[PDB]
Write a protein that binds this ligand. Structure first.
Ligand SMILES: N[C@@H](CCC(=O)N[C@@H](CSc1ccc([N+](=O)[O-])cc1[N+](=O)[O-])C(=O)NCC(=O)O)C(=O)O
Ligand SMILES: N[C@@H](CCC(=O)N[C@@H](CSc1ccc([N+](=O)[O-])cc1[N+](=O)[O-])C(=O)NCC(=O)O)C(=O)O
Lengths: 217, 217
């Protein structure tokens, strides 16, 4: 089987776990544990960081037979290509690229708050702008069923994830944008996904390490 | 022709300016200026940010007739597909995905440092990490002439860029790595690139905006 490595948290690997399940990939997980405050030990990871044969060691990582990958985005693309979940036309490919990249940007702005020690003072305002990001997703999506075009591609897994996290941080966000509420239910409604979500394997929260200020436990 | 907008700086758009050149693309640029301390005016950009017909407005952006792209990496990829600068086999495609993403990681680390109000005191720390970074790049490339295999592809434009900025920041960071200094010469050595570097269009520094601690001019 394949091996997926990451922190025993949701964080930025949600999209990959969803995808392995969607493609019915034969995989195993290694979920590393950090230590508690004050030191939050990383030894479980660090003891083996440099012993797996990875080009640029990091988490998440993926081992598949002789193939070893790091960089969450690269792992996504590799599975996309293996099960043919990419865009078919130049139009689709260009939407996919944009969305891949956008999600990363929004994921990071989030972290950095949820990691910003003034999480609170910063909060009110941060979520002052949560709306406008959401609006960008909505108009991009329009009336299509999937982000890239006619069928499901890798990017929907990425879009699903940040939109889910958003409506966790500001439940009242999804509100003005019904096409975003429907996407989330259509994604949640894919057979293989529905089953995963009720499984023992599923890990929705926490999103960050105990180090965070939100979804840290 | 094609239009490229970005700050009148190196920033993250160096790879694009280079690829447009290598490919003999007809294009013009809009180089937005930024006010000076203590307020750093952004209005030349802000006045049109929402009037270009872009899906997720940002800098840089590429208008190619009816195709409007944002996200530096998606612009890099649209150019690569158009000019056949992609990996040709699975191997090359995985190599490229990894490097693309790793570059962005190493670019963000530098930005975070150089924007930190504690530049002076934090630098010594950052300095210590360079040797490790460079080693990973050296060993990945090994003895191949370019990042993905026997042929130039778009990731070489991104790799060049990052390796060139770290070298500017820490002149002695590449001394222990032969293959990296050679890779830099091979790339600067390409016909269309030597020619552009001497042009009135060349812009190597500043690397950052006037609100950074290093190379803000
Ligand atoms: N660009 C890479 C980012 C991977 C990454 O940063 N991994 C973090 C987890 S996420 C993360 C992402 C960004 C930041 N951050 O502070 O900017 C912190 C974390 N984190 O885990 O705490 C990790 O713990 N790496 C193992 C290692 O470095 O040895 C990817 O997309 O795969
Ligand atoms: N993912 C994007 C990042 C685009 C971006 O953040 N652009 C900046 C300049 S670079 C930059 C600027 C700020 C930060 N930042 O972390 O605050 C990071 C970067 N960067 O290059 O990573 C900009 O000025 N945008 C104009 C706007 O938003 O209206 C891209 O790859 O194109």
């Amino acid at each position: 089987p394949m091996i997926l490595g990451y922190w025993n948290v949701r964080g930025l690997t949600h999209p990959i776990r969803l995808l392995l399940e969607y493609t019915d990939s034969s995989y195993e997980e290694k979920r590393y544990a950090m230590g508690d405050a004050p030191d939050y030990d990383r030894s479980q990871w660090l003891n083996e960081k440099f012993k797996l044969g990875l080009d640029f060691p990091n988490l998440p990582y993926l081992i598949d037979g002789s193939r070893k990958i790091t960089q969450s985005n690269a792992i996504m693309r590799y599975l996309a290509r293996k099960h043919h979940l990419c865009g078919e036309t130049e139009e689709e490919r260009i939407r996919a690229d944009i969305v891949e990249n956008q999600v990363m940007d929004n994921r990071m702005q989030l972290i950095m708050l949820c990691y910003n020690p003034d999480f609170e003072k910063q909060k009110p305002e941060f979520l002052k702008t949560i709306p406008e990001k959401m609006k960008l997703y909505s108009e991009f999506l329009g009336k299509r069923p999937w982000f890239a075009g006619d069928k499901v591609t890798y990017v929907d897994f990425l879009a699903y994830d940040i939109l889910d996290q958003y409506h966790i941080f500001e439940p009242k966000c999804l509100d003005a944008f019904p096409n975003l509420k429907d996407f989330l239910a259509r994604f949640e409604g894919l057979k293989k996904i529905s089953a995963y979500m009720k499984s023992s394997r599923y890990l929705s929260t926490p999103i960050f390490s105990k180090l965070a200020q939100w979804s840290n436990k």
